[PDB]
């Protein structure tokens with residue numbers, strides 16, 4: 001799932017998101033499939049808080065543009081003590097992810113939905129002096145959105161839904177730049193095999209953006225036992241804006257070159273500075289999901305779900321400055337599928353148990369996968385439980401645990417000329433687990 005995150009509540013996490021938001025009176029419908037809101041008979045307010053623990057590691061090699069094993073370079077440029085390098089260490093993280101849903105039926109035909117969601121999120125921080133520093137150091141992306149939706153009941157077996165999401169994305173990327181290595185491979189300054197890791201500066205890009213998105217859905221209940229749903233979330237145009245700066249620890253090599261205007265001579269059309277304003281498109285991919293919930297009896301309900309994400313829109317990551325390209329990195333993500341199956345079982349009038357599993361394809365591919373987002377296909381295994389209060393005017397608590405088994409993937413990353421011409425040869429191992437807890441208030 002690259003850097004897209006499931007936008008559900010604890011109950012959803014408990015069943016690996018199977019059935020989407022089609023289970024009875026699930027406030028998450030306010031965003032996931034607004035149409036299902038037409039079948040929620042009362043006011044519901046819900047808050048979810050997840051903690052995601054992600055483990056990321058690299059095992060392998062890295063080479064400079066001349067085929068030499070990468071080294072740790074120098075403390076502060078030629079003449080200073082040589083530094084050692086490393087495997088990057090643990091690049092994973094632990095993060096909190098809140099989610100809120102509110103559903104308010106208006107008429108016997110209309111319902112209103114409000115929600116706070118986190119559509120996008122990823123993070124990887126490799127030790128600054130690791131062997132793959134020419135490809136990545138830090139990567140941080142998070143998208144939080146506020147939503148408003150409306151549902152319209154056409155029949156007692158069909159309804160439609162539509163909504164708008166106001167999204168805010170913040171992004172950060174840091175990566176080592178080796179000007180001498182870039183020059184050696186340039187169309188204007190090549191010829192001399194400058195040694196690698198003599199010049200070095202940390203490139204840092206910080207950008208943000210707020211823009212609107214639209215989504216819609218439809219629900220069809222053929223047999224009171226079966227609830228089918230189709231939801232579509234359109235791609236969200238998202239041009240991130242901010243700045244970039246280079247933190248040189250070169251003994252003055254990098255700044256001397258830049259102030260000397262040598263970069264533009266190496267790569268005509270390039271206007272690199274020690275710092276400047278910047279932009280980078282990072283559209284939130286469109287996706288569609290088909291959900292089906294079948295109630296076998298008064299205690300067992302199962303759900304199946306298939307989501308097609310149009311990750312193909314993420315063709316490249318291009319850093320621009322004043323409308324001009326600084327560097328364009330191809331990623332050519334592939335469209336993806338995510339299948340889930342799971343369900344709920346009411347043990348008593350108070351207790352309910354959940355479980356589920358899902359298969360989620362990674363949009364990354366071998367030719368372009370790098371250390372920023374080194375994921376692979378994942379298998380999701382979830383367990384959940386819910387408790388409705390005895391002496392309460394309707395307050396339910398839910399818990400969930402979810403483990404994500406990610407397959408070990410290869411990294412064969414090659415850097416283009418202006419990025420130093422180096423390459424990686426290894427594999428990333430990742431692991432993920434989520435703890436979820438929510439409180440649902442059925443005030444009505």
Ligand SMILES: CCCCCCCCOCCOCCOCCOCCO
Pocket residue numbers: 002005006052054056095097120121122123141142372373374375376378404406430431432433434
């Ligand atoms: C502030 C950081 C954004 C927080 C991101 C929350 C995303 C957490 O995980 C949701 C479940 O993801 C499952 C798989 O494990 C992650 C994959 O390995 C990472 C390499 O691409």
Ligand SMILES: CCCCCCCCOCCOCCOCCOCCO
Pocket residue numbers: 139140141171172173174175203205207240280282317318319327331364368369370372373374
């Ligand atoms: C398989 C890896 C895909 C990597 C995608 C990471 C994209 C996520 O967002 C990064 C934040 O966007 C802003 C960065 O600046 C643009 C490019 O970096 C500049 C070159 O050093």
Ligand SMILES: CCCCCCCCOCCOCCOCCOCCO
Pocket residue numbers: 177179180182183186189199203253254256257260262263264266267272326327418419
């Ligand atoms: C994100 C893209 C970065 C693009 C970098 C291209 C860098 C190109 O070459 C610049 C040439 O640098 C040459 C030498 O090293 C500097 C030494 O000081 C020399 C003073 O004339």
